[PDB]
Amino acid sequence: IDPFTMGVITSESEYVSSLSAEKLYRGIVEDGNIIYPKALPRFIEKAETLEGDGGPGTIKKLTFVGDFGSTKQHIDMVDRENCAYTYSVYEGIALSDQPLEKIVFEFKLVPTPEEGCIVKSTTKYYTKGDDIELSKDYLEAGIERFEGFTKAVESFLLANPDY
Amino acid sequence: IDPFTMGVITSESEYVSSLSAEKLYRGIVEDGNIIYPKALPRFIEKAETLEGDGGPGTIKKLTFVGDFGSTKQHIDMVDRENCAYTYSVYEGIALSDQPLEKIVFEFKLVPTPEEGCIVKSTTKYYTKGDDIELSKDYLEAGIERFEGFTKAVESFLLANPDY
Ligand SMILES: C/C(=C\CNc1ncnc2[nH]cnc12)CO
Ligand SMILES: C/C(=C\CNc1ncnc2[nH]cnc12)CO
Ligand code: NA
Ligand code: NA
Ligand code: NA
Ligand code: NA
Ligand code: NA
Ligand code: NA
């Protein structure tokens, strides 16, 4: 009479970077705490590690510039060899008319022959409740924001090879 | 031996709109609750009035798309005749190394002969503490965000004369 229901809504976006997979990956994953505020000086005030050594299970916190609060990232998968990174957000993620259980952010960087890379981004929204309503603008906002972080880092690193 | 100290840091920006002062003012001030999400579908989820009839003393709340929280605006001055609007934000405004007492946002729209208007924006940061440290990127972030709201509304209204 009463099923358990869950939706998983996946959005995929790609773009081609002229920066190498290795460099972009290091920028975001290893050196993020320094690079995020430098790349996004008007959006990210601070990026810090609250728990863990940087591997799976690590908890990071981004604090945003202005009255936009802060958010924790819970690191799931860290694969330097394959330039792959996954983390989850658990809090402050509800819409007005759709609660969410979590949002998962995944990127994979794939080298191209030109020695740039394809940046493969994914966002996955996991729904809470017995039904589902998610708008195009929302679903787009999330993957654009995420891909926009990566793009900002790429631009900073091209501009500043030593940081 | 111990003074009371406060800083008031004022940032002023202008730009010229092709939309009339009257129309832009109505869009933001009178019709904001409908227009903000329509103009900024990927940033503002909802804009609502919590208390008051829209005049001075009114409290509005913007809810942001994604994990960026929400913020209350406390309406101070509402002058339709002069297309002027002022409100304050009190919460979620600290920097990591500088508490703030409040941020005041003011705009004045001045008709030009072309029947567009000059949009005069001001942000005022009121400091909390016995000393002061505020960076250029921060001070810029605030007035750019604010002027960016107004610009988004201007673009939506030019594109949609009936909403
Ligand atoms: C980025 C910063 C402020 C921007 N926030 C706002 N800017 C303009 N209007 C508002 N209403 C509520 N919050 C805002 C830094 O102070
Ligand atoms: C606009 C939306 C999400 C964007 N937020 C994030 N996007 C990418 N990485 C993150 N880390 C913490 N929060 C984020 C809507 O889900
Ligand atoms: Na902040
Ligand atoms: Na948050
Ligand atoms: Na469910
Ligand atoms: Na939100
Ligand atoms: Na807020
Ligand atoms: Na003081």
From Swiss-Prot, chains A, B:
Induction: Up-regulated during nodulation, but not by Nod factors or pathogen infection.
Binding locations of trans-zeatin: Q73, Y87, Y138
Residues that bind N(6)-dimethylallyladenine: Q73, Y87
Expression sites by tissue: Expressed in nodules, but not in leaves, stems, flowers and roots. Specifically located in the nodule cortex.
Residue sites binding kinetin per the record: Q73, Y87
Top-rank taxon, per record: Eukaryota
Keywords recorded for this protein, A-Z: Cytokinin signaling pathway, Nodulation, Pathogenesis-related protein, Plant defense
Keyword rRNA-binding: no
Biological processes per GO annotation: abscisic acid-activated signaling pathway; cytokinin-activated signaling pathway; defense response; nodulation
Role description: May be involved in nodule organogenesis rather in the processes related to nitrogen fixation or interactions with the bacteria. May regulate nodulation by controlling the levels of freely available cytokinins.
This protein's name: Nodulin-13
Organism whose genome encodes this protein: Medicago truncatula (Barrel medic)
UniProt gene name: N13
